[PDB]
Design a protein around this ligand. Sequence first.
Ligand SMILES: Nc1ncnc2c1ncn2[C@@H]1O[C@H](COP(=O)(O)O)[C@@H](OP(=O)(O)O)[C@H]1O
Length: 246
Amino acid sequence: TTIQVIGAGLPRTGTNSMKKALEIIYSKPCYHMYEIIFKKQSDISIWQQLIDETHKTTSDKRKIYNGLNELLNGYIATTDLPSCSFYKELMTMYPNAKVLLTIRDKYDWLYSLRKVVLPKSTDPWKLKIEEGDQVLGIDSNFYKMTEDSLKFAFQKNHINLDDDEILLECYDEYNRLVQEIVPPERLLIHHLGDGWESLCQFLNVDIPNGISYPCANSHHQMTQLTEQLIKHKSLDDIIHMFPGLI
Ligand SMILES: Nc1ncnc2c1ncn2[C@@H]1O[C@H](COP(=O)(O)O)[C@@H](OP(=O)(O)O)[C@H]1O
């Protein structure tokens, strides 16, 4: 089992649904941000080390390749941050792996991003997200990894993350760059709502009979999850309220 599909799409572009879609298609696991959160929080420090490495005047590419390979051992694909930021390295490591770019309307994307991943520093909701995440054992270590990997994707060292206009332009530039660098034949651009047909055609497989395309991780659901984590202080006690998520 090695990487067959590299998810280049940014957070809040349907990466969890794509993770689940690929797991249906291949019957093998796909890496995702939520693997880190709900299964493997020890991966946070590893990713942080790899992202830190890219900031050196001479990065150790071999260290990065080895680190990526160890992180993704046992997985058939990967999606979302932090791995999407390393799509060029992953292409080099896995020359026969196809690349998926999940994409959506940039304003819907920014809105979703502010609700779930990157609230503005003085958004009162930011404190609520953090309180809920405490229940899961998630703290500033995770947020630093997330933000650094986003800055890496955007190829910025200095960025005002509270600037909506910068984030919108970085999003368009990121998506444009993916389409430029990845040869057309090993790229599929998958738009939010495209479903099974284009994906299965791209991967040379049949559309899964009687199985719907995954559709969870909405910001409405995420907001409910945060609220319920705060209320009950136990993921176990509320997980029955959130099927098809983790
Ligand atoms: N099958 C589907 N059809 C339409 N939207 C989908 C979808 N699957 C996921 N999404 C949307 O993709 C976003 C989550 O992406 P990610 O998994 O990368 O975090 C959510 O957007 P919203 O927050 O606007 O609801 C979610 O609703």
